[model samples]
Target: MSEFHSEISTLSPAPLWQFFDKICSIPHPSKHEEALAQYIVTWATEQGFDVRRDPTGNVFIKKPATPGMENKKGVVLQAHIDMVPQKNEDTDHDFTQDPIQPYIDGEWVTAKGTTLGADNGIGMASCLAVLASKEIKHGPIEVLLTIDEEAGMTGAFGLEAGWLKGDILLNTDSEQEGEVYMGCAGGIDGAMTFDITRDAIPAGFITRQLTLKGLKGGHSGCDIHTGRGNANKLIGRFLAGHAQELDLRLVEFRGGSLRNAIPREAFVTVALPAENQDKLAELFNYYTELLKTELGKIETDIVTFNEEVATDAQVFAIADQQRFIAALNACPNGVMRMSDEVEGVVETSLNVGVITTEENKVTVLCLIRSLIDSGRSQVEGMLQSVAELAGAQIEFSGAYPGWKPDADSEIMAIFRDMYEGIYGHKPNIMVIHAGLECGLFKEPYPNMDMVSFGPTIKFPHSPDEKVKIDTVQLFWDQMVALLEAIPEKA
Candidate 1:
């Protein structure tokens, strides 16, 4: 605990804030959570609780209920112990060693130079606070902490049967503090590959690089419907539209960040006749202005910049480069449609998330999401067609199903009752657009009742991420009270 020593009170809601502060001191980025996992085990053991770790590195801690409440039903407190690694473009912080420098702003605690790691950090901290506190009254409690939830739900996917002692699960990983997430959308990643053939640049064509930057990239699931411009699509369109007129021969191109995030920047290298260089620059400027006008409402800060590179005079053939640009320009991006049943909810959407070209291989990665499985398949097929038409091979990975909402869930009722009793108000029950481990957890425990809730967090999976300091107390209070009120089975 000394390693986490800081001004504890700086954490809003106090107790859980202290725990979150400590979590920030330790580097626990996704897929690299061994130290944090061991830290949890060590803390639990020192507190006289029974702690265990599974082969997949998931941790479970069990604490007995108070006297006379021993016969009460048991409940599981769940959270992922990993965080997405995100940093500001100019920041020099390392995700593996540096402590997250969090500071209080109006109502939230944000990192000084990088992501605050509040997405699931708050979830883990709340669980630790409940298990560590002596004043909280509760039934037999099982704390199940998972890992690598940000990159993939690997820990939850690897959960072994009969390992957990509780039937009712309370997931503290939701972003909105006052909302109870009953369901979440499914997700899948679609990857496309293109083989490149380089040809010598036409006798007098000069090469240059075009870049688009200063756009606000956000979570693909949460912000897909916001009408943000996709840098890959925009840059591809620009090149494709002027390829013939400018005699542009593409050498390489790349854009986007994570497969699950909207692309905020893109870059392309191309060769054109020296005589047409000035004209191409003018064309780029005109199109840049046009894009700004078109996406000004959403991409207020969007910028398209060009620079001449003194590189090897060799570049790709005009014909091959033109074909690649055409295919990329034709690829689909942005929200496809809204859910017919859920108003204001996106039913289907596609994000052209990543593109990279190196040597003779060009790869494009796209992510599709939908509440309707058929809709997701439709978008995926469209992406494949676009890639194949551009003479590229396609491959898919990380496909998973969505969890439909259970309207009559017994677990939901328990949460509602406990929340109302503790806070005198019913929590907002809704479904999230993002993926969760619950979808996979249901595959093994088909009959298990699960619900997710947590403190307020914003800008997850991005450098601007932050968590509400005051919400942690409310989150911890609701969780502890709900555990104490678990109903006995008839």
Candidate 2:
């Protein structure tokens, strides 16, 4: 096998791979899908199918069922086109200009130093294969391709009402191949802000910074169970406990990366009394040992660096500084509770994803997820209390609803019977801990029966994303079977 080409090229389900290869050849990162959308439109045109483009940039292509299956219920095949552009710190690959390089390593198809793009790309591939398929038989189908799903879910949120004509929706974006998802947690963005007061640095103040890096941060929903420490939380603990005692004045603090991902690193810039140099080191050393002992092996590289950067102009006044630290200390983070209904599921949770301190105020943005509306309301009360006590303001945005599972769905029964027959065992029916666009689809199409499933992909929304080679075949085969088994409309 060539280095650039994949060893899975000669594997089964030929058209799926053929379609995935073409999809990868074009650069279509989030918010930059002009070329890919045009390509899909052109390809659909060549196939004698009519394509509809929505105002929100969602593409819809309708296909009729085979002659004998025309009366069956219509099914909507859905997938997002955009892939997250995550690469290792040392990698120079450009997501805009360069194509993702996928290679086979034993049972997995992974990229080197970058994301494999198979998170939803494979889902897109499977849908296209169904469109191009000549031998497979199925009910009436509509392939709904969404854009910018990775960035902010613009595609899902902006979908106009009455654009879809399907009675059922099949979302092919789940990662754990055999696990069929019936429902998912809804999410909201919690933004906290405090109007702080600042004072001029004292004449004899010295500049110092405390950095906490090298933590194994991961997806706030999927990997939050790892018991990993949040950098923002760790930094807050140190500052709230020792800031005033050690005569430290806060200059500025910046931490974390994305709002949906747990922060891997954070640093605090401060001005301390020149006479308290030894106390600063003493505090740093104590926290290092404490975090190591408390966090155990979870945060191994939890080292703090106290270097002297160039002096800053002002530091937050003592009153405002105490208020700022107090808010974060009161703010709850990590898995809040476990689901009583489902054995090991997370019911409600929040990750303090990003923190920033501007000139006038410090902002804290977190992603809050819950299994129910009541859970969201409960957490909102807690957040409100914390922010108000700290003299801060709070607002919520981007609130996506959760998909409710139906144990009585006929569509669910059909999938269960077919999957057991194909794999010689019952498939796991689950509700994912993360958010899904299918929930948004439910808002407008209340009668649309929906479920989500896909191949085995790991480490989505990160640089180490990969998919299992064999599960691709499993996913393809199961999709073909499901389409063929669509019972006639009741």
Candidate 3:
């Protein structure tokens, strides 16, 4: 192997750094994962493995394990082949065609201007490394790579029964290294739309856009407990408080980006009385300070901006504006409950992820996650009730179930023994709060023994995302050891 290839090969734990490096060199953002899928198929074919692509572009590659392990239990190695397309506010990188520029900083590998795609790409790379290696001993192995894992589990949701010939599945999508994840929380997305009525602006009213920015946004599931302020909620609160004090008429408001991401910025356009302009600015400064104090330590850099707009006509009537502001203030966000079953795990939470207001319509998207199905449904119902009270039509989608852990699982015991033998330490086995494809996979194969593990990754779904270089090798070692230890059938 050449120096570069050798460096790629030597990438620790999973020997998948080379594959990850190659993947970063291509643009395979969610929904546009064709190039990566094609690359996998081409490589699988070249390696003499049986590869097939489904209608949705989910790739499955079958490789027979080592000779003596052929008769052992068949297993599936699964990972999503796509990544979330999140870039820094100043980066000019596009998610469709531009490849991620990744570099090593100390022991971490991350992208220069965008997300590193390590959330699941490492899983894909690990699977590829195993598929390409002939020295690793294992039984029949099915490499299942799904698409569109970031936006939603669309690829997994569209999977057909009998797609794979495996009774046990090892999912490589978890973020922490040395942690074995047996289950994940269930989730549902709620969408609320309100009709906007435009009218002429009343005379003597000043028009301005209320802006809220610089909030430290993060993954809804992973960082909800950090007390980070949601820009949408903050903007709405400002509007509601201003409306009460000043003769202000709301026009349109907008904020947030993805349904799964915490909103970092938000803004609202409104008409304020000229007399109240000075008072409004004073009140804004006061509230901004109060917000800074309330969100102390968590949102230290929070800033608010108000800019006057020169518009020819009015956008929204005063009544409509008040309703919109009120609706947003009533919406839910942040941690709702703590997990009673597992210590320190979040049981339920809601993210008012996106909010957009146009000329004739205002829409808000809220995402909810909970390990308990009833808790998830209760939150959804609460959102529906709030939407109804606000006179807005509500919709729901992207609902998925949680993968409940089975402690008595035979594969669980096997993984524990394998990890103890390999690392001389017990693996941290627990459940995660984020949504995983395992829930969808369980719908198709209820009896499959499923578990998820991967290399150490931080700041996933963000521009600062990075994967640990050394953990990849540990991940690969655990995978190979677990496969080798599988019990042979009679």
Candidate number achieving the greatest TM-score relative to the actual structure: 2
Error of 2 at 392 (Å): 2.0
lDDT per residue, candidate 1, 1-490, as tens digits? 2324546456555667788888989998888898899888998899999999888889999988877677767788888888778888888977887788777766666786688888677888878888887777777888989887877678888666788756678888788877987766777898888777677777767888989988888889988888788888888888777777776777768898888889999999887788888898999999999988888888889888889884664566655676677878887788887765544677778788899988877888889887666678888899878877877888877777666566557788878888888776899887667777876776566567689988888888877786776777788777777776777653
Q: Sort all candidates by lDDT, best to worst.
A: 2, 3, 1
Query: Per-residue lDDT for 129-188 in model 2, tens only?
Result: 899898778988899998877776888867756777767889998887778887778889
Candidate 2 lowest-lDDT run of ten: 1-10
lDDT of the candidates, in the order given: 0.79, 0.84, 0.82
**Which of candidates 1 and 2 reaches a greater TM-score?**
2
Best by lDDT: 2
Check candidate 3 and list the clashing pairs: 12-472, 12-473, 13-472, 13-473, 13-474, 14-472, 14-473
Superposition error at 125 for model 2 (Å): 5.7
Q: RMSD of each candidate?
A: 6.6, 5.5, 6.2
Residue range 17-111, candidate 3, lDDT tens digits = 77877888889888888888888898889878888888877899999878887786989999987889889999798799899877777777788
Which stretches in model 2 have alpha-carbon errors above 4 Å? 1-71, 80-140, 147-153, 158-161, 165-167, 174-176, 200-214, 241-248, 269-287, 305-313, 371-381, 395-417, 425-436, 446-449, 455-473, 487-489
Two-way TM-score contest, 1 vs 3, winner:
3
- Candidates in order, TM-scores: namely 0.68, 0.73, 0.70
> How many residue pairs collide in each prediction?
0, 0, 7
